[PDB]
Design a protein around this ligand. Structure first.
Ligand SMILES: [Ca+2]
Ligand SMILES: [Ca+2]
Ligand SMILES: [Ca+2]
Ligand SMILES: [Ca+2]
Ligand SMILES: [Ca+2]
Ligand SMILES: [Ca+2]
Ligand SMILES: [Ca+2]
Ligand SMILES: [Ca+2]
Ligand SMILES: [Ca+2]
Lengths: 523, 523, 523
C-alpha cells in the first residue's frame, strides 16, 4: 500500500510476491501458476531495476517495442544489444577496381570459438566442481573462420607472387544480433585482424543495411544472397601475412565499437527513434550485471542479469541461484527436479560449464560451506561470466537419444541412476560413428558419469581416431565424471570408434559428445 | 534539529557519527561495525566535502552513477578520472602509404617508471624514517615502453638509412582508465615524446575510441586486438633520434588535455551527459586534496583524498592519519593492527613507501615529536604525494607466503616477532630463484628486517647475479631495515643466488623482493 | 548596528579589527593572536574593497573558489591572474614542412631580469635610502632567454647561410601563472621580440591548452616534456637579425593581451564559467592598486595592493606601511622585530630592494621626516612599484647559515649586534666558493653591513675571480651598507674567492650574495 518510486506497484509488492494481470497488480498465492504467469523479483528503492531505458512497470506489462524478445519481461533481465559479424566466402584477386587471377573458398563461422580455445581439460574433477577453467574470455562479438573445402594446396601457387607485390582480399559478410534488443541506426565498425597484425577496418555506414535489425535476424533474410565487400572499397595485404594464413593462423573478424538507436513508445502512436541513442547505457548495464551465454550447435544466445554484491547490506537487490538466473534469462519449464528448454534439457550434468579464473576461484571458495555440493546452488555475484555449451550429441539412457548410430550391449534394467535408469555393464560396450556426420578438423570431448559399488573395480576406454588412445578408469562408490578429448580429420578417412571394457558390475550414465574448437591444418 | 548546508544531514551528527540506512540518517553508536555498516566524516560548513559535483549525502546514499566504483561512495574521497595510453608493439616501415623494408618489435608498457627512476638506495635508514625519496614526481598518466623481443641487432641493419632520409613509425596503443570516475565524450590529446623532443601529438577525437570508457576497463574490453594508428594518419622520425633510441632512451607517452562529461540523473527519468564537463573540477580538486597512489604488480590505482590545513583553525574540516586515509581511500579489512585486501597485505613494514622532497621534509619534521616512532600515526596535510609499491615476492613466515620456492632451514616455532612468528637461525639461509619467473632487464630491491639482542653478532649476505656482491650487516638493539639492490639480464642465464649467514643468534623477518625500474640495454 | 555597504558587517567592525568565525564577524581584543586568527581592515564606502570581483565578506568567509590561494583571503589583496610564457629549447630548421640542417640548443628562462637589468651600484649609500634605482620597469609577463650549452661556434656555422635566405625557427614553450587567481578560458597572445624588432605574434587559441591553468602550476605539470609549437605554425628570419644574436642580444618574449573567466558558485549547485570575462576588471585593479613583485630562486610572486592617496581627505581607505603590506600580501610570521617565511627571511637588511625612479623620488621625499631611519615604515600610495629580490646566499652569524663553504676566523662570542650576535674580527677572513654551483655568464653583487668602534680603522677587500677587484673601505660609528659587483665565466674557470682583512676591532654582519642579470658573450 506504500509507494516509493514512480511506479504503480507498491513497495511491499516489489518483494516476495508479484503478479501483473489486466494492466493491474495482484499478489501471488500459488493458484494460477499453470495459466501463463511467471514470478517477477525487482528492486524497491530504485525506479529502474536494470540499466535498460525502461521502468520496471513498462517491461512487466508489455507496453514497449514489439521487436524486443519476450524473454526480457522479467525485471532482472535487460535489453542489451549486441551486433556480431560473420564471414562466409572469401575471394582473392590481384586487381584493385574489381582482368586477373581470382580464387574462391567457402568458410564456416564459429561464434563461441575464442572463448573455449584456451580451455584445458583434466582427467579428474576435484570435489563438486564439475566445470573447467578458460585462459581468456570473449563474448560472441568476435567470430572465428574455418576453411572447409581445404584440399592440400598452397595459396601462393594459385596467385604467382614472386618478391614484393601481393594481391587484395574480398569477401562476403553477414550482420547478426545475439540478444534481446534491436538496433535501428546501425553503424558498426569491424577490425579484420590476422594474428595481431591489423589489416583494415570496415564501416558499412547506414544506407547499405537499412533502418532496422530485428533480434534473432540478419540482413540476408535466411537463405538469400549474402552481402559482399564491394558495395570502404577493398582490402590490401603484403608478402608477410599470407604464409601465416596458409600455415596455422585464421582470420579474426571482430566488431569493436557499436552505435545505434532504439524505440520508445510515445503518447499517441508508433515508435520514435530520433532523440535517443545507445551510447550511455552500455556501462550502466555492464557494470551491474553478469553475462550468461548459451551455445546450442545451431544458434547462440547471450543475456545480462543483475546480481548482488556481498559487501553492501543496504543494497536490497533480488538474489538468485545460478539455475534460477539461467531459467529467468533464457526461459525454461520446471519439471520434477529438472529444467527444460523446448527440446534440449538443461542440467549440471547434461551440458558443459565454462567459467574464467575469477569465477572459478569464487565458486571453489563458496562451495566449501554448502552441504549439497551442487553447482546450481551457488549464490549470484556481480562481475562473473558463465558459458554453457550444449553437446552436439547427448544420451541419458532414457526417452532422449540423438545419437545417429545405436550402441551395443545396452541393459536399461536398472534404477540406481542419477536421473532415472542406467546401463548394466557385463562386457564390452561399443559404438561407431561415420566421419560424414562430424565436422572435419575440430576438437571433440566425450564425457560421462560412472559408479561402482565395489572396492577396486576398473574400466578401460579406447577411443579410435587419428590419434587412437586407451585410458584407465578406477571408479568408486561415488559418482565420477570422466571426460576425454580427441581430434578429427578430413572426410576421406575412416570412422570413429568408442569402446569400453569392464568387469561386469559398474554403471554408466549421462553420455555426451561436445565440440569445442578448431585445429590448424598443415597447408 | 540544526542545519547548515543544503543537505538532509543534521548538524549535530555530522562530526563523529554518520550512518545511512533506508535513505535515512542515524548516528553512530559503535555496535554494528560487523554487519557491513560503516561510518564516515564530512565538513559541516559546505555541502560538498570533496570537490566532486555531488553532495555528500547523495554520494553516500548511492543515488548516483552506478559505474563508479563502490568505495568512492566514501565522501572523503573524490571522483577523479585518469586516461592513460601505452604501446603493445612497434613497427617501422619506409612507405608513407603503408612496399619496402618493415620491422616489428614487441614491447610491454609500464605505469610507474619515471616516478621510481629518481630513487636511490642506501645500506641503512636513519631514525624512524622508513621511506625513500625521488628526484622527480609523476602520476600514472605517463607510461614507459620496454622492448623485450630484441636480440643483438641495430635498427639500421633492418632499415638501411644512410644520411638524412628516415622511415616512418607506427604503433599499437591501448587506452585505460585507472580511477573512480568514467567519462563519455573522450577527447584525449597525447604527446609521443623521446627524452624531451616531441615527435608528434595525436588527437583521438570520437570515432576511434568510442563514446564510453568504463573505469577499470581498457578500450578493448579485456582481451581483444590492440588498436592500430591507421585510423592523424602517420608521424615521422629522423636519423638523429634513431641511434639515440638504440643506445639508451625509450619512447614515452603522456596525455596533456583530457576532455569529457560526467553522467547524472535528470529530474524525471534517464541519465544525461550533455550539459556537463570534466574540465571545471580538475583544478578545484587538485588544489584541495592529497594524492595517494598504489601499485600492485597486476594493476594500479590512485586517489585524491581531502586533508586539513593545520594553519587555519577556522577551517573546520576533519583530520586523518595515513593508515586511516589508506583504509578509507582504497577499501581494506582491518584485522588486529593489519590492513588486508582480498589477497595483498599492506602495513608499515610490508610494502615500499615513496615520497618527494617536500613530503620527506614535512615527515622528518613531524616524526620527531611523536612518541611512538611510526609512519602511519601522522596527521595528513594537504599537497603531499604518497606512493605505495607492493613487492612481487614477500613473506613474513606466517599464514601469508607466495614465494616460487621454499625457504630452507626455517624455525618458525617462535613468538618474538613484529607480527607473531620469526625466523630463528642456527645455520645458513639459501635460495636459488630462477630467471623463468622474473622479467628480464630489471632492477630489484631485496628488503628485510633484522634484529638481535646481542652485542656484535654480525651477519653477511651474498647476492650472486650478473652484478654479484657481498655485504656485511651488523645488528643493533633496535629493529633495523636493510635494503640492497641488484640487476638482471635476459632469460637465457643461470639462476640468481641469495645467501645469508650469521652466527646462530640473529632474527630475520619480513623478506621482500620488489622491482623498481628498467635498465638501458646495450644494442 | 550601523551599516553602509552591501555586507552584514557594521562600519565600526570594518575598522581597527576584523575577525571571522562561524560565518559571523567579531572584534579583536588581543587574546586569540596565537590561535591562528588574523586582523584585517577594509573600506566602508564600497562593497568591493579591492578590485577583485568579490565582496569583503565573501572573500573573507571562504565561500568562494577554493583554487584561489589563501594569501588572497584578506580583503586588502586583490585576485589578479598573470599568464607568462617561457622558452626552453631553441631548434633551427631550414624547411617549411618539418629534412634540413637543424640545430637544437637548450635555454633557461629568466622571469624578473629586465626590471633589474638596468641597475647601477654605488660605493656608499647616502642617507636612509638602502635600496637601488632602476631605469625601467617590467612585470613577470616579459621573459628573457639565456643559452648555456653553447661552445665556441657561430650559429651561421651550423646553418651555412651565405647571402640571401635564412632558416626557420621552432621552439619549446611552457605556460605558467604567478598570481592569486585562476583563469579558465585562456586566450594567450604573445610577441617574440628581438631587440626592438617584432619577429612574430603567436596565438595559441583554446585547444593547445584547454580551460584550466592553476595559479603557480605550469602547463606541463612539474616534470614532463616541454610543449613544442608544432601543434600560427612557423616563423621566418632574415640575414640581418641572425648575426645580432651572436654578439650581445637575446630573444625576449612578451605577452600582450590575455583574457579569461573567473568561476563563481551559483545559487544551487556547481560553478559557471561561461557568462564571464577577465576584461572588465583589469583596469579596475591596475589603475588603483600598486605592484609588489617578489623573486625567489625557485619561484616568483606578483601581487597588487590598494593604497591611500595622501592628497585626498575625502577618500576613506585603509592606510598601510611597507612591511605590513608585504605581510598581508604574502602571509608572514612575525618574530621579535623580524619577518619570516617558512624558511626565507625578508627584512630591510636581509634582501635586495628595487624601486622605480618615481617611487624612489617619492620615498626619498618621505624619508626625511621620519625619525627612525627605517625603510619599511613608509606609508603606501597608489601607483608605486616594489621589487624584493631574495639573495641566493645570505649569512648573519645566527640561526640561518646556509653557505656551502665555511668561513675563516669565525668569532661568535659577541652581543652588540643588530639582531643577536656579530662576528668579531681579528685578522684575515677567507672564503672560496667553488665552480660546482655557480650559474655561468651571470652578474653577482655581494653586500654587507659594518661597524667599527674606532676613529680611523680601515679595512681592505679583495674579490678574486677571472675579473678580480681590490677596494679600500672606511667604516663609521653606525651601520654602514656596502655593495660590490662581479661576473663569472664558463665551467673551465677556477673557483671564486672573497677576502676581507681588518685590524681586529671592526664588526661585520649580514653578508648577502645575490644575482642581478646576464652579460653578453663573445661568440
Ligand atoms: Ca516502488
Ligand atoms: Ca522498482
Ligand atoms: Ca539415467
Ligand atoms: Ca551537512
Ligand atoms: Ca554538509
Ligand atoms: Ca613474521
Ligand atoms: Ca560593512
Ligand atoms: Ca567593505
Ligand atoms: Ca646578527
Amino acid at each position: 500500500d506504500l509507494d516509493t518510486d514512480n511506479d504503480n506497484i507498491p513497495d511491499s509488492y516489489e518483494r516476495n510476491g508479484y503478479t501483473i494481470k489486466d494492466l493491474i497488480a495482484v499478489k501471488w498465492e500459488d493458484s494460477f501458476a499453470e495459466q501463463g504467469y511467471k514470478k517477477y523479483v525487482s528492486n524497491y528503492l530504485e525506479s529502474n531495476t536494470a540499466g535498460d531505458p525502461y521502468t520496471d512497470y513498462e517491461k512487466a506489462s508489455g507496453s514497449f517495442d514489439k521487436a524486443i524478445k519476450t524473454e526480457a519481461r522479467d525485471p532482472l533481465v535487460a535489453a542489451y544489444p549486441i551486433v556480431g559479424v560473420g564471414m562466409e566466402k572469401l575471394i582473392i584477386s590481384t586487381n584493385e577496381h574489381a582482368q586477373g587471377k581470382t580464387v574462391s573458398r567457402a568458410t564456416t563461422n564459429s561464434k563461441t570459438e575464442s572463448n573455449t580455445a584456451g580451455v584445458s581439460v583434466n582427467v579428474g574433477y576435484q570435489n563438486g566442481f564439475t566445470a573447467n577453467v578458460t585462459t581468456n574470455y570473449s563474448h560472441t562479438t568476435d567470430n572465428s573462420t574455418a576453411v572447409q573445402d581445404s584440399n592440400g594446396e598452397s595459396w601462393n601457387t594459385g596467385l604467382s607472387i614472386n618478391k614484393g607485390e601481393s594481391a587484395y582480399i574480398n569477401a562476403n559478410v553477414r550482420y547478426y544480433n545475439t540478444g534481446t534488443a534491436p538496433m535501428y541506426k546501425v553503424t558498426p565498425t569491424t577490425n579484420l585482424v590476422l594474428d595481431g597484425d591489423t589489416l583494415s577496418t570496415i564501416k558499412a555506414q547506414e544506407n547499405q543495411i537499412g533502418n532496422n535489425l530485428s533480434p534473432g535476424d540478419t540482413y540476408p533474410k535466411k537463405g538469400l544472397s549474402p552481402l559482399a565487400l564491394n558495395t570502404s572499397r577493398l582490402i590490401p595485404i603484403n608478402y608477410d601475412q599470407l604464409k601465416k594464413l596458409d600455415a596455422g593462423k585464421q582470420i579474426k573478424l571482430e566488431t569493436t565499437q557499436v552505435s545505434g538507436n532504439f524505440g520508445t513508445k510515445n503518447s499517441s502512436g508508433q515508435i520514435v527513434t530520433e532523440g535517443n541513442s545507445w551510447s550511455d547505457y552500455i556501462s550502466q548495464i555492464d557494470s551491474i550485471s553478469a553475462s550468461i551465454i548459451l551455445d546450442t550447435e545451431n544458434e547462440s544466445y547471450e543475456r545480462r542479469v543483475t546480481a548482488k554484491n556481498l559487501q553492501d547490506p543496504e543494497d536490497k537487490t533480488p538474489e538468485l541461484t545460478i539455475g534460477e538466473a539461467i531459467e529467468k534469462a533464457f526461459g525454461a519449464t520446471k519439471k520434477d527436479g529438472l529444467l527444460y528448454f523446448n527440446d534440449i534439457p538443461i542440467d549440471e550434468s547434461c551440458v558443459e560449464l565454462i567459467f574464467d579464473d575469477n569465477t572459478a576461484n569464487k565458486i571453489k571458495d563458496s562451495l566449501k560451506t554448502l552441504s549439497d555440493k551442487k553447482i546450481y546452488n551457488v549464490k549470484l555475484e556481480r562481475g562473473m561470466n558463465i558459458l554453457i555449451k550444449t553437446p552436439t550429441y547427448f544420451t541419458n539412457f532414457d526417452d532422449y537419444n540423438n545419437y545417429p548410430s545405436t550402441w551395443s550391449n545396452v541393459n536399461t534394467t536398472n534404477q540406481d541412476g542419477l536421473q532415472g535408469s542406467a546401463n548394466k555393464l557385463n562386457g564390452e560396450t561399443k559404438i561407431k560413428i561415420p566421419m560424414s556426420e562430424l565436422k572435419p578438423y575440430k576438437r571433440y570431448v566425450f564425457s560421462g558419469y560412472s559408479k561402482d559399488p565395489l572396492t577396486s573395480n576398473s574400466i578401460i576406454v579406447k577411443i579410435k581416431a587419428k590419434e587412437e588412445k586407451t585410458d584407465y578408469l578406477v571408479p568408486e562408490q561415488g559418482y565420477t565424471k570422466f571426460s576425454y578429448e580427441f581430434e578429427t580429420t578430413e572426410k576421406d578417412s575412416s570412422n570413429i570408434e568408442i569402446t569400453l571394457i569392464g568387469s561386469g558390475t559398474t554403471y554408466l550414465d549421462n553420455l555426451s559428445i561436445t565440440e569445442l574448437n578448431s585445429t590448424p591444418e598443415i597447408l
